[PDB]
Design a protein around this ligand. Structure first.
Ligand SMILES: *C[C@@](*)(O)[C@H](CCCNC(N)=[NH2+])NC(=O)[C@@H]1CCCN1C(=O)[C@H](N)Cc1ccccc1
Ligand SMILES: [Ca+2]
Lengths: 51, 235
């Protein structure tokens, strides 16, 4: 997690093997690329959607 | 907000205004459908308070406003342990009926203690409110917002003779001119992390507004994140 949050979009924690497990805040789901964060609800926190 | 600019409708969908004995007297931010987080000094007493989400222009009707009553108020348990310090200036408001989330009514994200502090140290946050736009001046009709840089603790300390605790941080410009102000208290200081905003502070206090050599003082939310999540649990 040392450099750029282990390329995690939101949260990062050190597992082992010098590897990274990413995670996201409530309302978001860990995208299948196992790094990015995807909305899992219609109006997730902290996002502007008025467009 | 002094030296800021008009928000666009829904630019800060987590922002709410507080109304009571005084209209538009403080701000707050949406934790979830039932809970607002604000500054404790806004909500001393047991006086009736109303919350308006989806607000933009407080004198006009946008048909996005949702008004709710406050049924319960939880100031932090250590607020006013020491008189007139504004240490622990943070409080939670429970709404009588849940907000209906939409593009104009959206919670602010709240990370853990560690990441809230990391995000604060990005050094740049947005503050918003309907407070004074000039010092001892007029209050804003349209929601204002301002980007304010983080100020290092050592400079913060020397800027004022009042006490800056580890539950506070400074933000503002060394040359002055831009600041939160009276009426902005309880408003969110938020940090944008790749399109997603997190709560990193709460407008708390200062000495006048926007004066050179002075900074806005904010409640350090990282210290209260565990408390917030504990008290606002939805069942
Ligand atoms: C309650 C909030 O609206 C308000 C926000 C002020 C933020 N100011 C700046 N420059 N960003 N907070 C307050 O009014 C708090 C609580 C009550 C007193 N107070 C102050 O900020 C006073 N200005 C503190 C003070 C300074 C000098 C002498 C006496 C008191
Ligand atoms: Ca309005």
């Amino acid at each position: 997690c040392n450099i750029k949050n282990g390329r995690c979009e939101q949260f990062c924690k050190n597992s082992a093997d010098n590897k990274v497990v990413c995670s996201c805040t409530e309302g978001y789901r860990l995208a299948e690329n196992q790094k990015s964060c995807e909305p899992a609800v219609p109006f997730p926190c902290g996002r502007v959607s008025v467009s | 907000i002094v030296g800021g600019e008009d928000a666009k409708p829904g630019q800060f969908p987590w922002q709410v205004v507080l109304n009571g004995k005084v209209d538009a007297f403080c701000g707050g931010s949406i934790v979830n459908e039932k809970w607002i987080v604000t500054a404790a000094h806004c909500v001393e007493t047991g006086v009736k308070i109303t919350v308006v989400a989806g607000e933009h222009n407080i004198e006009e009707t946008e048909h996005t406003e949702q008004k709710r009553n406050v049924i319960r108020i939880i100031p932090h348990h250590n607020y006013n342990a020491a008189i007139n310090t504004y240490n622990h200036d943070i409080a939670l408001l429970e709404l009588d009926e849940p907000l209906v989330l939409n593009s104009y009514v959206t919670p602010i994200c709240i990370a853990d203690k560690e990441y809230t502090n990391i995000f604060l140290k990005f050094g740049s946050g947005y503050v918003s409110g309907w407070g004074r736009v000039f010092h001892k001046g007029r209050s804003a009709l349209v929601l204002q917002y301002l980007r304010v840089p983080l100020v290092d603790r050592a400079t913060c300390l020397r800027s004022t003779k009042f006490t800056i605790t580890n539950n506070m941080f400074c933000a503002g410009f060394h040359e002055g001119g831009r600041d939160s102000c009276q009426g902005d208290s309880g408003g969110p200081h938020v940090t944008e992390v790749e399109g997603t905003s997190f709560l990193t502070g709460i407008v708390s206090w200062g000495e006048e507004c926007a004066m050179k050599g002075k900074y806005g003082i904010y409640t350090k939310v990282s210290r209260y994140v565990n408390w917030i999540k504990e008290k606002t649990k939805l069942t």
